[PDB]
Amino acid sequence: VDFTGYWKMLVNENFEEYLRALDVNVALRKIANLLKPDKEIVQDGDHMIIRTLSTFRNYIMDFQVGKEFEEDLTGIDDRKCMTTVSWDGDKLQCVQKGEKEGRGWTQWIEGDELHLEMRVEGVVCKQVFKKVQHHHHHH
Protein backbone atom coordinates (compact mmCIF):
# COMPACT_ATOMS: atom_id res chain seq x y z
CA VAL A 1 0.00 0.00 0.00
CA ASP A 2 1.05 3.61 -0.66
CA PHE A 3 -0.89 6.30 1.21
CA THR A 4 0.64 9.18 -0.76
CA GLY A 5 -1.99 11.65 -1.89
CA TYR A 6 -4.48 14.31 -0.88
CA TRP A 7 -7.66 13.23 0.89
CA LYS A 8 -10.78 15.16 1.83
CA MET A 9 -12.97 14.32 4.83
CA LEU A 10 -16.30 12.64 4.05
CA VAL A 11 -17.43 11.44 7.51
CA ASN A 12 -16.26 11.93 11.08
CA GLU A 13 -18.04 9.59 13.51
CA ASN A 14 -17.98 9.96 17.32
CA PHE A 15 -15.25 12.65 17.37
CA GLU A 16 -16.77 14.53 20.37
CA GLU A 17 -16.40 11.54 22.68
CA TYR A 18 -12.83 10.98 21.47
CA LEU A 19 -11.90 14.59 22.28
CA ARG A 20 -13.70 14.46 25.63
CA ALA A 21 -11.67 11.38 26.58
CA LEU A 22 -8.52 13.42 25.82
CA ASP A 23 -9.73 16.20 28.17
CA VAL A 24 -9.89 18.76 25.37
CA ASN A 25 -11.75 21.75 26.78
CA VAL A 26 -15.35 22.51 25.87
CA ALA A 27 -14.57 25.63 23.84
CA LEU A 28 -11.96 23.86 21.70
CA ARG A 29 -14.21 20.84 21.21
CA LYS A 30 -16.90 23.15 19.82
CA ILE A 31 -14.43 24.56 17.29
CA ALA A 32 -12.85 21.20 16.45
CA ASN A 33 -16.14 19.37 15.85
CA LEU A 34 -17.00 21.81 13.02
CA LEU A 35 -13.70 21.21 11.21
CA LYS A 36 -13.41 18.85 8.24
CA PRO A 37 -9.64 18.46 7.85
CA ASP A 38 -7.84 17.22 4.76
CA LYS A 39 -4.98 14.70 4.89
CA GLU A 40 -1.86 15.30 2.78
CA ILE A 41 0.36 12.22 2.95
CA VAL A 42 3.80 11.59 1.50
CA GLN A 43 5.17 8.06 1.89
CA ASP A 44 8.91 8.25 1.04
CA GLY A 45 10.39 4.84 1.69
CA ASP A 46 9.70 4.29 5.39
CA HIS A 47 9.69 8.06 6.05
CA MET A 48 6.00 8.95 6.41
CA ILE A 49 4.58 12.48 6.57
CA ILE A 50 0.88 12.79 7.46
CA ARG A 51 -0.35 16.40 7.45
CA THR A 52 -3.78 16.86 9.03
CA LEU A 53 -4.81 20.20 7.51
CA SER A 54 -7.65 22.45 8.66
CA THR A 55 -8.66 26.08 8.44
CA PHE A 56 -8.16 26.44 12.23
CA ARG A 57 -4.81 24.71 12.78
CA ASN A 58 -2.82 21.83 11.35
CA TYR A 59 -1.33 18.76 13.05
CA ILE A 60 1.79 17.39 11.37
CA MET A 61 3.19 13.88 11.81
CA ASP A 62 6.64 13.21 10.37
CA PHE A 63 8.22 9.92 11.41
CA GLN A 64 9.90 6.65 10.38
CA VAL A 65 7.64 3.60 10.22
CA GLY A 66 8.78 1.00 12.72
CA LYS A 67 10.78 3.40 14.92
CA GLU A 68 9.38 4.63 18.21
CA PHE A 69 9.45 8.42 18.63
CA GLU A 70 8.39 11.10 21.10
CA GLU A 71 5.13 12.48 19.64
CA ASP A 72 4.27 16.08 20.61
CA LEU A 73 0.46 16.46 20.59
CA THR A 74 0.48 20.24 21.13
CA GLY A 75 -2.66 21.73 19.62
CA ILE A 76 -4.71 18.59 20.34
CA ASP A 77 -4.47 17.65 24.03
CA ASP A 78 -1.02 19.02 24.82
CA ARG A 79 0.37 15.62 25.86
CA LYS A 80 3.41 13.69 24.66
CA CYS A 81 3.45 9.99 23.86
CA MET A 82 6.02 7.38 22.93
CA THR A 83 4.52 6.46 19.59
CA THR A 84 5.20 3.65 17.15
CA VAL A 85 3.59 3.37 13.71
CA SER A 86 4.00 -0.11 12.18
CA TRP A 87 2.86 -1.99 9.11
CA ASP A 88 0.36 -4.79 9.67
CA GLY A 89 -0.18 -6.12 6.14
CA ASP A 90 -1.86 -3.30 4.24
CA LYS A 91 -2.86 -1.42 7.42
CA LEU A 92 -0.86 1.10 9.40
CA GLN A 93 -1.12 0.57 13.18
CA CYS A 94 -0.19 3.31 15.65
CA VAL A 95 0.26 2.84 19.41
CA GLN A 96 0.63 6.06 21.43
CA LYS A 97 2.06 5.07 24.83
CA GLY A 98 1.42 7.63 27.52
CA GLU A 99 -0.97 8.81 30.18
CA LYS A 100 -4.12 7.59 28.42
CA GLU A 101 -4.80 3.87 28.16
CA GLY A 102 -5.52 2.32 24.79
CA ARG A 103 -4.47 5.36 22.75
CA GLY A 104 -3.71 4.82 19.08
CA TRP A 105 -5.16 4.47 15.60
CA THR A 106 -5.41 2.26 12.50
CA GLN A 107 -5.28 3.59 8.93
CA TRP A 108 -6.01 1.78 5.65
CA ILE A 109 -7.31 2.26 2.10
CA GLU A 110 -10.45 0.86 0.47
CA GLY A 111 -10.81 1.92 -3.17
CA ASP A 112 -10.86 5.74 -3.25
CA GLU A 113 -11.26 5.95 0.56
CA LEU A 114 -8.77 6.53 3.35
CA HIS A 115 -10.10 4.93 6.53
CA LEU A 116 -8.88 6.07 9.96
CA GLU A 117 -10.04 4.61 13.30
CA MET A 118 -8.81 6.64 16.30
CA ARG A 119 -9.00 5.16 19.80
CA VAL A 120 -8.45 6.21 23.41
CA GLU A 121 -9.75 4.81 26.71
CA GLY A 122 -12.15 2.47 24.91
CA VAL A 123 -13.67 5.23 22.76
CA VAL A 124 -13.69 4.72 18.99
CA CYS A 125 -13.84 7.54 16.41
CA LYS A 126 -14.04 6.61 12.71
CA GLN A 127 -13.11 8.94 9.85
CA VAL A 128 -13.31 8.34 6.10
CA PHE A 129 -11.68 10.57 3.50
CA LYS A 130 -12.03 10.55 -0.30
CA LYS A 131 -9.02 10.77 -2.58
CA VAL A 132 -9.03 14.15 -4.38
CA GLN A 133 -6.96 15.85 -7.08
CA HIS A 134 -7.56 19.62 -6.75
CA HIS A 135 -4.72 20.85 -4.61
CA HIS A 136 -4.13 24.12 -2.87
CA HIS A 137 -1.30 25.74 -1.04
CA HIS A 138 -0.85 25.29 2.69
CA HIS A 139 1.83 26.02 5.29
Ligand SMILES: CC1=C(/C=C/C(C)=C/C=C/C(C)=C/CO)C(C)(C)CCC1
Ligand atom coordinates in the same frame (compact mmCIF):
# COMPACT_ATOMS: atom_id res chain seq x y z
C1 LIG B 1 -8.49 18.54 18.42
C2 LIG B 1 -7.90 19.42 17.32
C3 LIG B 1 -7.46 18.92 16.18
C4 LIG B 1 -7.31 17.38 16.13
C5 LIG B 1 -6.45 16.72 15.32
C6 LIG B 1 -6.33 15.20 15.35
C7 LIG B 1 -7.14 14.38 16.32
C8 LIG B 1 -5.40 14.70 14.52
C9 LIG B 1 -5.12 13.22 14.34
C10 LIG B 1 -4.18 12.84 13.45
C11 LIG B 1 -3.95 11.40 13.09
C12 LIG B 1 -4.63 10.30 13.88
C13 LIG B 1 -3.23 11.19 11.98
C14 LIG B 1 -3.04 9.88 11.25
O1 LIG B 1 -3.79 10.10 10.03
C15 LIG B 1 -6.94 19.79 14.99
C16 LIG B 1 -5.41 19.80 14.99
C17 LIG B 1 -7.50 19.32 13.66
C18 LIG B 1 -7.38 21.23 15.17
C19 LIG B 1 -7.20 21.67 16.60
C20 LIG B 1 -7.96 20.90 17.69
